[PDB]
Structures are given as structure tokens and as C-alpha cells.
Amino acid sequence: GDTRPRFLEQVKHECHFFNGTERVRFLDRYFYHQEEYVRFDSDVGEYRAVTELGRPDAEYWNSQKDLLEQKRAAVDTYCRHNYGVGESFTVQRRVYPEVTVYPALLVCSVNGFYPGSIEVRWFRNGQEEKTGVVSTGLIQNGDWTFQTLVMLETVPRSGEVYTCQVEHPSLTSPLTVEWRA
Amino acid sequence: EEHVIIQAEFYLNPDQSGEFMFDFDGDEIFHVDMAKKETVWRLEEFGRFASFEAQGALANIAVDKANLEIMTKRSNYTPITNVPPEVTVLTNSPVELREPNVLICFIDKFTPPVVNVTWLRNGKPVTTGVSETVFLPREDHLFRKFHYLPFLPSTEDVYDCRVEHWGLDEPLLKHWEF
């Protein structure tokens, strides 16, 4: 196969938001392959080398006052601005999950929801099941939806009622799917 | 944190390939098609709510190329070490015969951002309605990528996501079947 050497440059301009846009942290990061060599942290206010290979850049960049001036205003002109621009379809995005219960071991598959924050609980005869419950964890489908599977190992009694209950920001109340043995 | 918006870019030599995208909480908002010079929204609906001058992105990629050359020399031409992808194939929804679903080939934790992904149905390549995402950034600075294959679940079909990456000696095949 192609074994020619590869050289990669990555740049990440990050905007970390806390409590809405009350607190915003802007990071201007530069990577050589996977190694970050220089970065501007708004909590620091200037470029700082992360590795010796970055020192050269951190020096020349801090030397430009119009440059540091731009970076220092980034939390507002960049982060807060973009946050405002995309808020309605990112921050406020709420897609409700579909819940499917099927016999595997009972599987509760919660699919297509957004955001990721979700609570999935297994109930047996109206009591929450804790032991014998396994979750695949949160899964990012890559299309702005998540899915997760929560399994319940059990031995149903005559006509036992199992309930998978989901709580999610998109729903006013829990979403319930009941399966009767 | 509650949310993180990241403008991630990369330039790779000798491939001369580049990328410019915006990530929100791990999901791609959009990426720039540098040839057509257009903003490619991850979800079409996004284009109705916001805008972005795709062309402005070329300025960044131009600088990134320049920086790559400077850093390449500074590192005394130290190449990247391939990091093979861990591949997972799952369905986006529970599987039911005759109910359209989508096979998701999750290619994760790899670098460099170059991969050949093929879908095989019963050992033969399938392209019908397939789609993929560009290379998504990871906090460890490796990459994630998604490939999709819509399909009609059948007890008679078997699928494989075949991934070729320089971190692998041979194509990696992740199997899936009903």
C-alpha cells in the first residue's frame, strides 16, 4: 500500500460555553499531526507554546497587537456571535426519542433523539430494576441524533409487566412503553 | 461546559487534501466543499436558519498548508504515525424485516484522515444510496467518520463495512447480519 510519509496540520478554534453565554472560553489551537504546539487561551490572553516547536509562533503572534486584539475579542465576535447564530437549531434542537421494547433478556432501544442527555429506566411490576440492567451507553449516529440500548436480564412471572421509561428534554413527561409477559 | 462549538480544519500532505468544518457538541454543523466552494450543511434544514461564506474557508486552508510546511520542516520531517481505526457497524434503528433501516459504519480513533470505505452485501460491493460524513475531529485529535447504507432488512443478506486505512495491513471488515 501507499506508505509515503504523511504530514498533518490541524487547527481548532474552540468555543466553550458555560451557563448559556455567561462564561465563554475561546481556544485557538494548532496541531502538528496530533500534537498541539501552540494555542491561545482566552483565559490566558496570549499565545503560549505547548511544545518547543510552538515557541516560534507564540512569539511572532503575540508581537502583533492587532492580532492579539482580535483574539482577545474572539469570545464575543466569534464565540458568542456564532452561538447566537446557531442557537435555534443546535442549542435548542430537541428531537424526541422513539422507544422500542423487544425480547432478546429484554431490550429497550431508544432511538433518534437529540440532545444526548437522556434517562432510560427499566421497571418491573412498577418497580425500577437496577440489578441486571446493562446499557450500551450513549451512541452518536453522526446525523444529529443519538441512540442507546438498555438491556434487562430477567425471569418474568405470569403476566409480568415490564416498562421502559424515557425522560428527555424534548418531552414534557416520561415516554413509556410497556411490555407484558 | 454545556456546549462547545469547534471550527476544525486540517491540511494533509502529500495528499494535498484539506477540510474545514464546524462541530457542535460532537456533531457536524457543516463543512466546506473547497472545489464547488459551497457550505455543505450536515442537515439541509440548517441552511434555512443560518449562512456561512464557504469561500472564506479557503483562506484558512491556505494558511494551514503554509503552517504544515513550516512545521514539517521544524519537526525535521517527522511524519505522522498511522493510528488504525476501530470500526463498528450498527443500525440506526431496531431491525425489523421489510422495514427500511440504515447500516452505520462508525470509523473511529484514526489518523491520518484518509480512508477507503466500501459496503459489501453478500460479498459484493454496494453503493446504492450510500452516504458518508467528512472526517470529524476528536478531543484526542484523531478522527471519527460515518458511512451509511440504507437497506431493507432481510434474513438472506449479510453485510460488511470494509475499511482501508494505512494504519491497517489489510482492509478491515466489520460484519453485520439479521
Binding site: 475561546f26 456571535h81 | 471550527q7
Partner: peptide, 6 residues
């Protein structure tokens, strides 16, 4: 959206 590379 506003783009922010040195």
C-alpha cells in the same frame, strides 16, 4: 456564521 488561522 463567522470563521475565525494564523
Amino acid at each position: 456564521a463567522r470563521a475565525x488561522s494564523l
